[PDB]
Write a protein that binds this DNA or RNA. Structure first.
Lengths: 180, 178
RNA sequence: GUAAAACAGCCUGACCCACAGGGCCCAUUGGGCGCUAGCACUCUGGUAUCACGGUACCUUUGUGCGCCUGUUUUACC
């Protein structure tokens, strides 16, 4: 459909595979030389992006104003190629949709576009012991290595998958103000 | 970098294709026109990147004397036009000191291979058939039929066979398209 | 002959000047220019299609990297 036609373009032009000490993660690039990974990635001073060594110029583990974990890392990479500016495509506040697709790009999960269904705001969650805010939840079995997955609806990036359990999957929301 | 241009080329013009005879890298040259190793011999539909597409033509390529070029040219029913890489095809065959063979298939996902010097080669008895315009590089090679053999600013040809440490690509001449 | 590094750039009377004229391209009376080597985003329009949210190619503009010639500097064949 058009959600699939959006997601495929999205991963083709803005997604990447990234390797850190903890494993393989889909990574999404937002604008200029700036991109987003799970807080859990714990990106080093170098990351293998598409098996290629790239230097990290900066890394913010993202947190709200009262200081609890948002589960996103924003990193600025030292590279000459700039990203397609998708800032028009991510929401101002968390976004509910009846239908979304999660796009995963790892050796494990090559070119994976996965229909999640309804995405609903969720807010607070004690995610493996950590109090984390602004989650979204969709209804699907999630496995390992989809952390980093891109939650999408036509013309809208809704969040980045950061964890799940059994029959529920959770994405950190992706807000406009985090950039610019 | 042959590497940086070849990744560009494979993101914007390459694809993975399934036909009744196997899985092949496919490259699209312009609009809805793309080229395949003649061996696949597309049916009325083919799976392109796992989405089934209708094929409106499939010309098996041959010189004026009628000899086999090992290339099928097919027109796909899709609204998207391919990036016009015709400016990268030489008018006729090109030798190149260092070249890369680029594959996009499930077996060989995102493969980039420095083959080295490529030399004109011409005639070849390809499994019992005489074939013209082969190009030869020295690299060990099956299931890569379809790979895109190229260098920076030059797409030169499509791999169609090999043996041991020798690999041959049907040349890609500018005049073949329109 | 090969490797790092700096200045410059359409041509016409190594640099910086100065004038004058010859040429191409523009989003023009105002400006840009080495590309047989490109890659990336970006901007003006277009063409097509779509669940009207997009997406694909065409073209154009910048900038980053990459590259090519003139000239030259250190350490080496």
């Amino acid at each position: 459909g058009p959600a699939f036609e959006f997601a495929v373009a999205m991963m083709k032009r803005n997604s990447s595979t990234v390797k850190t000490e903890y494993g393989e993660f889909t990574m999404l690039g937002i604008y200029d030389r700036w991109a987003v990974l799970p807080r859990h990635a714990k990106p080093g001073p170098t990351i293998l992006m598409n098996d290629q060594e790239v230097a990290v110029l900066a890394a913010k583990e993202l947190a709200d104003k009262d200081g609890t974990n948002l589960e996103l890392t924003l990193l600025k990479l030292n590279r000459n190629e700039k990203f397609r500016d998708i800032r028009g495509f991510l929401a101002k506040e968390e976004v509910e949709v009846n239908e979304a697709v999660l796009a995963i790009n790892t050796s494990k999960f090559p070119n994976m576009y996965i229909p999640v269904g309804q995405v609903t705001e969720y807010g607070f969650l004690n995610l493996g012991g950590t109090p984390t805010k602004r989650m979204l939840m969709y209804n699907f079995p999630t496995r390992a290595g989809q952390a980093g997955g891109v939650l999408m609806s036509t013309g809208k990036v809704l969040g980045i998958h950061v964890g799940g359990n059994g029959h529920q999957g959770f994405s950190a929301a992706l807000l406009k103000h985090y950039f610019n």
